[PDB]
Design a protein around this ligand. Structure first.
Ligand SMILES: [Cu+]
Length: 122
């Protein structure tokens, strides 16, 4: 089994996939986020955030209200299963989470909530 994925967010405000699979045998899963291109984090920074699909809009609403100071996520939001730091070009971050926390899930960038995709156990 594959229990990690590499994902990119670029200067064009897009991730390089819209779908992540978590093998049903994994007990931990690691997301390795990178940022090809050239724009720094104060221009085009990205993160990677995981919630249920049903919770995504509420996470984004409360994150918007929390603002830039908090990477557009409400601190300690119970609906956020895992998230990375905000990265700019040439930077990287990885997050690992317990698969026991996984229903339909989605990932998104809190800076650019249009950047999104699905995560599913398979
Ligand atoms: Cu972003």
């Amino acid at each position: 089994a594959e229990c990690s994925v590499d994902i990119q967010g670029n200067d064009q405000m897009q991730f390089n996939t819209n779908a992540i699979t978590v093998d049903k045998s994994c007990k931990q899963f690691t997301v390795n986020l990178s940022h090809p291109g050239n724009l720094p984090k104060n221009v085009m920074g990205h993160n990677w955030v995981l919630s249920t699909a049903a919770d995504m809009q509420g996470v984004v609403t409360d994150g918007m209200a929390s603002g830039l100071d908090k990477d557009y996520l409400k601190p300690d939001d119970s609906r956020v299963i895992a998230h990375t730091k905000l990265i700019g070009s040439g930077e990287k971050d990885s997050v690992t989470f317990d698969v026991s926390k996984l229903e339909q899930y989605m990932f998104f960038c809190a800076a650019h909530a249009a950047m999104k995709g699905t995560l599913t156990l398979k």
